[PDB]
């Protein structure tokens, strides 16, 4: 722990938890949001026999644990799970006590207000954090980009959000949430791999196939033409070496998996591709600034490490929108940490401690005070 | 008649000349100056601040 009473910066992103100290450039403890529990009961002795398993421990113990998600698309299952994982993060991973450091947290866009009131109340009772602040990840990604104008595409693991912000002001009237995310990607890839001869249901193979998505997946420039040329495609077809050692070969599926977000009719969504959701979002607001939105679009999330989103994005928007002004996307490398960086940025300036949510305000007005203290 | 015409046109020319005097005083110092954006290529990439 630093000698100074600097604040805690924790991004509880929908899919990854990244925690550390204020003034740091990158979060120190970063782990996926999976939680493992003992698949069977206790009869043995001498070691183990522990209920909750979180972090890399559960990653190593994936096979003998039922792998469960305490949060999915924002919905909260069991607050005890968050209690334990935050205990682990603060003491076993961050080696910090929350008594002496206020916490800045980031929440998924348009999270329930009742969810905020319950989570804040359990937090304040269970923990002894001196002060509090929670913010939407959209403005955090904006801060990471450091440009007040643009539309943020936050692609988490449970929801994809499109949020327009012009000159550093939120536009909730033109903000939308789409239920397509990593979960859907894994599902669709699971069914295609089932049609390829490999049919698995458990979560270990879920992580294997999301790793495959991280490594080999394409974003098709032209879809049906690329499957037509991918009929044989000995060179274009790509293989992976699974940890057991078998060589699993995939061809068109590499670019037929992310395409589903762009083409939701593959597995039955009324909503069109996410580019249509950015398009409608843009026109909902006044006409004039729309060009700037076209030229200032930002994309954020862990998924963004994949190739192909930028070219597809620009080409389709230019197809939909007039091609007079030039559209260009901006995306700094390793932007999944960017939100946490913005949290540090929030703690950088000396005005931030004017609106810390202190203990006594919550003791006076209950959780309801946040309704007036954040917004 | 010539006297009437001279008087009218002289008054008109007097108002015209008083109007010219203002333009004679200044003609360019009313416009703003140039500050177009250009060059800056030599600036570095890792900004001393994190808005990089
Ligand atoms: N290094 C990486 N390369 C590619 N994809 C990644 C990487 N790390 C994480 N991801 C993907 O990002 C997803 C998690 O998104 P996340 O960054 O938590 O969203 P948010 O920005 O809302 O927190 C995971 O499902 C995973 O598939
Ligand atoms: Mg995200």
Curated annotation (Swiss-Prot), chain A:
The modification Tele-methylhistidine is found at residue 73. The modification N-acetylaspartate is found at residue 1. One of its GO terms (biological process) is skeletal muscle fiber development. Pfam families: Actin (PF00022). Keywords: Acetylation, ADP-ribosylation, ATP-binding, Cytoplasm, Cytoskeleton, Hydrolase, Methylation, Muscle protein, Nucleotide-binding, Oxidation. Oxidation of Met-44 and Met-47 by MICALs (MICAL1, MICAL2 or MICAL3) to form methionine sulfoxide promotes actin filament depolymerization. MICAL1 and MICAL2 produce the (R)-S-oxide form. The (R)-S-oxide form is reverted by MSRB1 and MSRB2, which promotes actin repolymerization. The modification Methionine (R)-sulfoxide is found at residues 44, 47. The modification N6-methyllysine is found at residue 84. One of its GO terms (cellular component) is filamentous actin. It is found in: Cytoplasm, Cytoskeleton. Its main location: cytoplasm. Its EC number is 3.6.4.-. Residues 110-123, 358-370 are annotated as: Interaction with alpha-actinin. It catalyses: ATP + H2O = ADP + phosphate + H(+). The modification ADP-ribosylarginine is found at residue 177. SUPFAM superfamilies: Actin-like ATPase domain. PANTHER family: ACTIN. Belongs to the actin family. Actins are highly conserved proteins that are involved in various types of cell motility and are ubiquitously expressed in all eukaryotic cells. Polymerization of globular actin (G-actin) leads to a structural filament (F-actin) in the form of a two-stranded helix. Each actin can bind to 4 others. Interacts with alpha-actinin. Identified in a complex composed of ACTA1, COBL, GSN and TMSB4X. Interacts with TTID. Interacts (via its C-terminus) with USP25. This is Actin, alpha skeletal muscle. It comes from Oryctolagus cuniculus. The gene is ACTA1.
Curated annotation (Swiss-Prot), chain B:
The modification Phosphoserine is found at residues 8, 41. Disulfide bonds: none annotated. Belongs to the troponin I family. Troponin I is the inhibitory subunit of troponin, the thin filament regulatory complex which confers calcium-sensitivity to striated muscle actomyosin ATPase activity. Phosphorylation by STK4/MST1 alters its binding affinity to TNNC1 (cardiac Tn-C) and TNNT2 (cardiac Tn-T). This is Troponin I, cardiac muscle. Transmembrane segments: none annotated. The chain holds residues 159 to 210 of 210 of the full protein. The lineage of its organism: Eukaryota, Metazoa, Chordata, Craniata, Vertebrata. It comes from Homo sapiens. Coiled coil: none annotated.
């Amino acid at each position: 722990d630093e000698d100074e009473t600097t604040a805690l910066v924790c991004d509880n992103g929908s899919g990854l938890v990244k925690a550390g100290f204020a003034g740091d450039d990158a979060p120190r403890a970063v782990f996926p949001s999976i939680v493992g529990r003992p698949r069977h009961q206790g009869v043995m002795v001498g070691m183990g026999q522990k209920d909750s398993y979180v972090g890399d421990e559960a990653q190593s113990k994936r096979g003998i644990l039922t792998l469960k998600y305490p949060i999915e698309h924002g919905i909260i299952t069991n607050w005890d799970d968050m209690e334990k994982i935050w205990h682990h993060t603060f003491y076993n991973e961050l080696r910090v006590a929350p008594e002496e450091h206020p916490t800045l947290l980031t929440e998924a866009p348009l999270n329930p207000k009742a969810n905020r009131e319950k989570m804040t109340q359990i937090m304040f009772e269970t923990f002894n954090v001196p002060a509090m602040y929670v913010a939407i990840q959209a403005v955090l990604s904006l801060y990471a980009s450091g440009r007040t104008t643009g539309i943020v595409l936050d692609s988490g693991d449970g929801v994809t959000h499109n949020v327009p912000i012009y000159e550093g002001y939120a536009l909730p009237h033109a903000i939308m949430r789409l239920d397509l995310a990593g979960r859907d990607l894994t599902d669709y890839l699971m069914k295609i791999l089932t049609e390829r001869g490999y049919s698995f249901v458990t979560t270990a193979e879920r992580e294997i196939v999301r790793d495959i998505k991280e490594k080999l997946c394409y974003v098709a420039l032209d879809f049906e033409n690329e499957m037509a040329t991918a009929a044989s495609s000995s060179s274009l077809e790509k293989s992976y070496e699974l940890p057991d050692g078998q060589v699993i070969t995939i061809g068109n599926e590499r670019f037929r998996c992310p395409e589903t977000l762009f083409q939701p009719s593959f597995i039955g969504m009324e909503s069109a591709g996410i580019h249509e959701t950015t398009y409608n979002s843009i026109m909902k607001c006044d006409i004039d600034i729309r060009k700037d939105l076209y030229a200032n679009n930002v994309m954020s999330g862990g998924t963004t490490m994949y190739p192909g989103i930028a070219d597809r994005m620009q080409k389709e928007i230019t197809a939909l929108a007039p091609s007079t002004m030039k559209i260009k996307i901006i995306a700094p490398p390793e932007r999944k940490y960017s939100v946490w960086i913005g949290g540090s940025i929030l703690a950088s300036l000396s005005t931030f401690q004017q609106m810390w949510i202190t203990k006594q305000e919550y003791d006076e007005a209950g959780p309801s005070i946040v309704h007036r203290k954040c917004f | 008649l010539g006297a009437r015409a001279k008087e009218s046109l002289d008054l008109r020319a007097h108002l015209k000349q008083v109007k010219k005097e203002d333009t004679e005083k200044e003609n360019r110092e009313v416009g703003d100056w140039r500050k177009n954006i250009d060059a800056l290529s030599g600036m570095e990439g890792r900004k001393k601040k994190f808005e990089s």
